[PDB]
Design a protein that fits this description.
The structure is cut from a larger assembly and holds chains A (230 residues) and B (49 residues).
Chain A: E1 7-11, E2 17-26, H1 30-43, E3 46-55, H2 72-80, E4 84-86, E5 91-99, E6 102-105, E7 115-117, E8 123-127, E9 133-144, E10 146-147, E11 164-166, E12 169-170, E13 174-182, E14 192-201, H3 207-226
Antiparallel strand pairs in A: 1-2, 2-14, 3-9, 3-11, 4-7, 5-9, 6-8, 10-12, 13-14
Chain B: no helix or strand
Classes of the chains: A alpha+beta (230), B little secondary structure (49).
């Protein structure tokens, strides 16, 4: 009646780019699976993102320190795009500590055993003074979807410390999803197509785990359909 | 007036439905709904509009 799609070669043309293939897919199912996986990947992917940042020198987002050529708002904006993976802990607090002239990048963050920076060249700021020193506490936590700092700030009621700065956390690891259904020719069964999913991700989530999580979410959703409450 | 206290409030006001947005040529309008990124029509490469 049906043949079963199986995870076949998952190539990495780039660190952030992954092409995952599903060969044994029935014709008429390629578009269904492709669209479903695209939706799930863009919507419900768990990921690690920065939520709150504590900078020693400043009291709010709209100030600046000495020896930095980027506004504190610009540092927060750059940190928004920071790509990081945490394994054991759901919430971690990284410490960034650097003085001296130079481009303060992501690799300068004090790395723990459970925290991996997959984009070490991601510039955070620039120090243009010899004695200028940056010390920051960057809180990175797990989440899915898009949770801006205007919804949990109503669930925190004006967070008590004034030295901490909340940033909108885009937990989505994947930035681009495409799927192509093409005629997969194989000896058994004349009518089969394969689904080639081309994915651009910030490197935080592996494509294999990505597809597995999307399938898990879809199956959990379909569980309600399987057994109907009457 | 004995004293004056001036306070500056900085609102990081984000784009949302209802805000008036336009083009340079005169095309106007109001943002109706901010759909999730997936709902956007996307090209062959996969970039959603």
């Amino acid at each position: 009646e049906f043949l079963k799609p199986r995870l076949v070669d998952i190539e990495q043309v780039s660190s952030t780019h992954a092409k995952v293939t599903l060969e044994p897919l029935e014709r008429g199912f390629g578009h269904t699976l492709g669209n479903a996986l695209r939706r799930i990947l863009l919507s419900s992917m768990p990921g690690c993102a920065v939520t709150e940042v504590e900078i020693d020198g400043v009291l709010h987002e709209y100030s600046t320190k000495e020896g930095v050529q980027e506004d504190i708002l610009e540092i927060l904006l750059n940190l928004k795009g920071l790509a990081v993976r945490v394994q054991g802990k759901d919430e971690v607090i990284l410490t960034l500590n650097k003085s001296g002239i130079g481009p303060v990048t992501a690799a300068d963050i004090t790395h723990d055993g459970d925290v991996e920076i997959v984009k070490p060249q991601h510039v955070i700021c620039h120090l243009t003074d010899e004695n200028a020193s940056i010390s920051m506490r960057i809180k990175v936590q797990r989440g899915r979807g898009y949770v801006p700092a205007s919804t949990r700030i109503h669930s925190e009621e004006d967070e008590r410390p004034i030295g901490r700065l909340l940033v909108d956390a885009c937990y989505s690891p994947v930035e681009r999803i495409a799927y192509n259904v093409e005629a997969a020719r194989v000896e058994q069964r004349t009518d089969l197509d394969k689904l080639v999913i081309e994915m651009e991700t910030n490197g935080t989530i592996d494509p294999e785990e990505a597809i597995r999580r999307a399938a898990t979410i879809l199956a959990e959703q379909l569980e309600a359909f399987v057994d109907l409450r009457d | 007036v004995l004293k004056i206290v001036k306070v500056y409030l900085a609102v990081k006001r984000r784009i949302q439905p209802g805000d008036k947005m336009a083009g340079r040529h005169g095309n106007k309008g109001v943002i109706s709904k901010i759909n999730p990124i997936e709902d956007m029509p996307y090209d062959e490469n996969g970039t959603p509009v």
